[model samples]
Target: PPKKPKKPGXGATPEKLAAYEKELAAYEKELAAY
Candidate 1:
């Protein structure tokens, strides 16, 4: 068995938006290295 990627359901809260953007930056950095 393997873990599945969980898609985030955008929330109406600023906290969640910020968290999602943070992960976006992380993904960008990871992509830059590739």
Candidate 2:
């Protein structure tokens, strides 16, 4: 599936957080376009 787990959970490390935010930006952009 294209969907991913929504959260990084309690184990959110810096690297994961950075990528998460990046994807979040993309997600927001797509949502806005829709």
Candidate 3:
């Protein structure tokens, strides 16, 4: 099985990185809403 790369030396793809940012942003907004 292959492992997914994250941050730093891994040089993550823009699609996945952008998706991650979007998810994180939503999570933060939810926290603020709470």
Candidate 4:
């Protein structure tokens, strides 16, 4: 199988990067909780 395309960065702002990290962490936690 072919590898998937890389995801683009959230943005060039600290706030945007923070938000992206927070969302990703939350998603990981939720998945682990199941």
Candidate 5:
């Protein structure tokens, strides 16, 4: 069976994904800094 694509919420967009990646990178950096 094939996996289904994730449906975006009302406010989701490409910019949202970029923002999420940026935040995730910052979180990893902060964890490493500790």
Candidate 6:
């Protein structure tokens, strides 16, 4: 099967890239929280 595109401007859609950024932001926040 073909792999799903990973990221916008790279392979995925703009929405997906935005989602990824959101995820990264939360991930970093959690690190800071700890």
The lDDT of each candidate is: 0.60, 0.75, 0.63, 0.59, 0.64, 0.64
Q: Show where candidate 2 strays beyond 4 Å.
A: 1-5
Q: Weakest 10 consecutive residues, lDDT, candidate 1? A: 1-10
Better model by lDDT: candidate 3 vs candidate 4: 3
Clashes of 5: 0
| Best-first order by TM-score | 2, 6, 5, 1, 3, 4
If scored against the real structure, what TM-score would every candidate get?
0.58, 0.71, 0.58, 0.56, 0.60, 0.62
User: Any residue pairs clashing in model 5, and if so which?
Assistant: none
Report the lDDT of model 5 for residue 33. 73
As for TM-score, the candidate ahead, 4 or 5, is: 5
Candidates' RMSD to native: 5.2, 2.8, 7.8, 6.3, 9.6, 7.9
Q: Please tell me which model should have the higher lDDT, number 1 or number 5.
A: 5
lDDT of 2 by residue, 1-34 (tens): 2344366987889988889988888777777777
Q: Write the per-residue lDDT of candidate 5 for residues 1-34, one digit (tens) a residue.
A: 2222343578889987777777677766776776
Candidate 4: list runs displaced more than 4 Å.
1-11
Candidate 3 lowest-lDDT run of ten: 1-10
lDDT of predicted model 1: 0.60
Q: Is candidate 3 or candidate 5 better by lDDT?
A: 5
Model 3 lDDT tens row, 1-34? 2223344337778888887777677766776776
**lDDT per residue, candidate 6, 1-34, as tens digits?**
2223334564777778888787677766776776
How accurate locally is residue 18 in candidate 5, as Cα lDDT from 0 to 100? 79
Candidate 3 has which clashing residue pairs, if any? none
